[PDB]
Design a protein around this ligand. Structure first.
Ligand SMILES: COc1ccc(OC(C)(C)C(=O)Nc2cccc(-c3csc(C(=N)N)c3)c2)cc1
Ligand SMILES: COc1ccc(OC(C)(C)C(=O)Nc2cccc(-c3csc(C(=N)N)c3)c2)cc1
Lengths: 236, 5, 236, 5
């Protein structure tokens, strides 16, 4: 690790600076360095880690989608052959994406998840594990595609089981987990009815618990509830 | 795309 | 060069794909590879090269500005010392920026400029040389700051001299060169009156030549003319 | 910022 000589606190400080500068590759490298110090992450630090890699992989996913669409049109009936270049470059971006996902999954396996005992940390990391297997699934086509999908499902399911036992229905981590697992069902698992059922039940159970919240917690929960409703509107 | 967080 | 084994035409194709995917670091690497094939660049290729590196260095400049502003506030009367980290990270981004500028200047010196005989190519490359010395000047503070500034000025001046002799006043390369040299005067050379004079004279001479243009050329020239007016409005 | 191209 090229960050091995930097103080943990300095890595966290620089991750925050990188975020303000919109330098998300740097942010991710700083937070990888912080994880590799071996100490558990606080709530703020977990979110710095997630923000960093979500932005990096989000750019890669967007690029991959553009290139995949160009590749598919180049392979339609009537196209002018334009050589191996589109496939090659889509493959290049795909391999870089897979590398980022493998890096994140490696941090979770070594050793963030096994040391995460509190619900807010363990559910957070298992959601991340589901998310990054889901991104691997988005580009998978080989002997392991079903196994990648089942790895995403298994992580999400363990997270769901803990979240339902240990957090209120308005907890934003619980809500975001359900949002994303619902999308997994719709987009990855070809289970739109499960996707819709999960989003609706999550929304309704959260609605009924809003009365317990402060104004600040209310704002956090209703924000994600609106995303659940947005997806339901898209799907029905 | 559908929303994820 | 890691692009040495790829065909020139494939590098150009992939640069165009990278642009569509908003993968500008890749775009720049592909176009650096194409330049290093040793052949002159066509008009389209010159613009792919410029678009690629302008986007890369533009992100670096924006990050540097954010970090420099944080650094200056941390060094105001009353601040809470927060260690070397802001300076270190600003320096990191600065060194990466300087590296990109040095790479571009190296491509221009080896050997794009010396082989550029036509006005449209030679003025384009000399404008680029002025631009990338200007970006180096934006972050310079040492024994060489004046020399960096004079390198920018000298490149812009040679470009201006050729453009006035060899291109019409509405030529978009001539207009963009004047726009940027005007900004050089205002922001770098502490010569706001020169900046304003150049922008105004360029605008007026272009206005008087618009009658010679087709509808498509008119649209290209009036676009940059509007940027000249925008800057004049900012400055007066 | 002023405009450049
Ligand atoms: C992965 O699962 C989820 C991700 C986001 C969710 O909700 C939103 C999008 C509103 C959110 O970001 N909430 C939130 C909650 C607590 C702390 C932080 C935070 C601390 S530091 C920091 C930074 N960017 N520097 C951000 C942010 C919900 C679930
Ligand atoms: C450095 O000096 C200047 C830079 C831009 C200027 O004007 C604007 C911004 C309108 C412009 O981009 N014009 C233009 C003119 C001719 C060709 C191309 C082009 C060919 S390929 C390609 C691509 N992005 N793939 C873009 C673009 C003017 C001066």
């Amino acid at each position: 690790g090229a960050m091995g000589s930097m103080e943990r606190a300095s890595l966290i400080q620089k991750a925050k600076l990188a975020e303000q500068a919109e330098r998300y590759e740097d942010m991710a490298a700083f937070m990888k360095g912080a994880v590799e110090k071996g100490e558990e992450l606080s709530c703020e630090e977990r979110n710095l880690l997630s923000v960093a890699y979500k932005n990096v992989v989000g750019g890669q996913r967007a690029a991959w989608r553009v290139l995949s669409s160009i590749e598919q049109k180049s392979n339609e009936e009537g196209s002018e052959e334009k050589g191996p270049e589109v496939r090659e470059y889509r493959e290049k971006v795909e391999t870089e994406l897979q590398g980022v996902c493998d890096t994140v999954l490696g941090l979770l396996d070594s050793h963030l998840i096994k040391e995460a005992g509190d619900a807010e940390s363990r559910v957070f990391y298992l959601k991340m594990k589901g998310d990054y297997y889901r991104y691997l699934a988005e580009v998978a086509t080989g002997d392991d595609k079903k196994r990648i999908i089942d790895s995403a499902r298994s992580a999400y399911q363990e997270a769901m089981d803990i979240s339902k036992k240990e957090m209120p229905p308005t907890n934003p981590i619980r809500l975001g987990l359900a949002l994303n697992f619902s999308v997994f069902h719709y987009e990855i698992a070809n289970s739109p009815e499960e996707a819709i059922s999960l989003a609706k039940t999550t929304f309704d159970e959260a609605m009924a618990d809003l009365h317990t919240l402060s104004e600040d917690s209310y704002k956090d929960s209703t924000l994600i509830m609106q995303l659940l409703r947005d997806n339901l509107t898209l799907w029905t | 795309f559908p929303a994820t967080v």
